[PDB]
Point group: C3
Chain length 242, copies 3
């Protein structure tokens, strides 16, 4: 039983659906733990392919802005330990992992796209990482992945300067596999994924592994560096005023 996700599995696809549509799928502490539990189950289940998507209008508005005796410094520590573990589940996820981006995506839900195998977007999806505007720094391994996927010249605009991308721009810049018109989005994506799930399953998993294994150690080191820096930013005056 999940309180913040709807998780199903059938015919070789596991579907993990963010389910706080009244909060535009903001990721609160509970959803952090539950996404990790869903991923850990999906890593051992019978599915060939695992899909993340959002209920409703938004894919996700990112971290929930609403969440101790040992202080703001110890809440910072425990939040960093948790972020690091959460990102770690995406670095390690051993099967094909697909984002179906049904609408606007923000923050950590965008930065994680650099660790997904494929990303399909509705043309009403947008991609925004306004870290800078909130006195914070990158996470989700995006400090490593975004310059490499997008080019430094483009990644700067998104990561440092908080420019919001359209679906088309995110696709042209390598974050998004393909964009579909919103009225046909759901059909186009599921039809494709159902075909993909009929491919030889050990071949799909083994092909992902030969692509991803040699990079994991570096991604885990990137993730640890990001979380350490981010712990600092949370305790900063710019983060508080913003």
């Amino acid at each position: 039983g999940f309180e913040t996700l709807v998780v199903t599995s059938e015919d070789g696809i596991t579907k993990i659906m963010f389910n706080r549509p009244k909060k535009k799928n903001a990721i609160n502490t509970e959803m952090y733990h539950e996404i990790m539990r869903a991923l850990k189950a999906a890593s051992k289940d019978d599915s060939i392919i695992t899909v993340l998507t959002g209920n409703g209008d938004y894919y996700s508005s990112g971290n929930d802005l609403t969440n101790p005796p040992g202080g703001v410094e110890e809440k910072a520590k425990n939040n960093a330990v948790l972020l690091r573990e959460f990102v770690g589940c995406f670095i390690d996820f051993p099967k094909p992992l697909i984002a179906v981006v049904n609408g606007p995506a923000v923050g950590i839900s965008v930065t994680l796209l650099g660790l997904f195998d494929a990303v399909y977007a509705s043309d009403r999806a947008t991609f925004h990482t306004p870290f800078s505007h909130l006195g914070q720094s990158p996470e989700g391994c995006s400090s490593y992945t975004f310059p490499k996927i997008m080019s430094p010249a483009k990644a700067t605009e998104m990561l440092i300067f908080g420019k919001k991308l359209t679906a088309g721009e995110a696709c042209a810049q390598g974050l998004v596999t393909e964009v579909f018109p919103d009225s046909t989005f759901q059909k186009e994506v599921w039809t494709r994924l159902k075909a993909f799930a009929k491919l030889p399953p050990n071949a799909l998993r083994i092909s992902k592994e030969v692509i991803r294994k040699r990079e994991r150690e570096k991604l885990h080191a990137v993730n640890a560096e990001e979380c350490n820096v981010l712990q600092g930013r949370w305790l900063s005056d710019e983060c508080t005023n913003a």
Copy 2:
């Protein structure tokens, strides 16, 4: 020795050297330039010849309507004394060595992609210096459909060149690209209309071959040398994986 004069005779290739350019042409056009055991070996020989001749630039291209359908699946081989296992090992050693020749090739190496390209002939494109395509070339790596895994260093190069989100569709899910898509995604340098393709590309290559010859070579070396060690390790790892996949049920059934 691999010395020759103007043309080097092969059974599955046409190998010629004029205007400072050694041209290696797949020549099993009836079989869509499918690469059999004989062609793996002749290609490695042709590359050794090309690295040592007086060409400035080297081209790989196909005869007829296809660049290459990739590995020849009609090329059925007897099982040797150590069984299908020994056969999978033998084949893995040969692939590793074949890819290694592309990793190490020291002159500018250009692909002239005249028509459809499949498999190993596509994955190798990530080790090339330039790739020119006809607008009727297509690019297809249907490894998963055959119960196999990536080779040619593509498990490393394609994500980096195309982005992970585009490389996945091609490598894991077997999507076939048009020439325009392959160029948009970084694998192809430039696409030309089929009707003037050969004219335009060869005009350009003949110009390039008149550039200061040693500078061409030294610049490629400064770009490529520091990566070769990693590429070699990637190739070895892909070949070890594939050795296991060739013995799998999924691979058998797929044939």
Copy 3:
């Protein structure tokens, strides 16, 4: 402090370093190498949030000045390779967001350094040319590493090895340039954006850049060193000796 070949200003949280030999298409002479390094050193310590590099007049920069003793040509190529190395090293290490405002044609080292910038904005009149091979030379500015990664090997080759000159639109499509603007609106569009950028939280800007760049710097410094070594030799080859005399003639 005080500049012969640059104009350096600072306002609205932006330090602007402008190449200032417009009668030589902002060619970079030995003096400008040393000045750019002193300017970047100062900009790194001043209270600006963003630093910009641009060129005065019609060119960004035509790149190295070909006009450029005690141990003859042997020890000279050595000095020049030591200076090139130090010059490129300042870009690798520069700690604040570094932006290129490419006002017209760029050539040579002015192009290759763009792989070390944070953002790059171009006028549609700008072009990008690295004719190193034509000149009998090899790559620098870390371009041997950075350009295949940014542009794809297949496109980097055409630039670096074969001397293709890119339009602003092509450079942008291939990852080198952030955004291209019509020449008539370029200055206004860029500076408006940059002025808004300079108002974002400055420690977040600086620290974001740091988490992006820091872990790559070692590698970049190695690539720089290797490139300067090769180039030290190329400068003493018949193809370069010979090419430089032909360009003397232009």
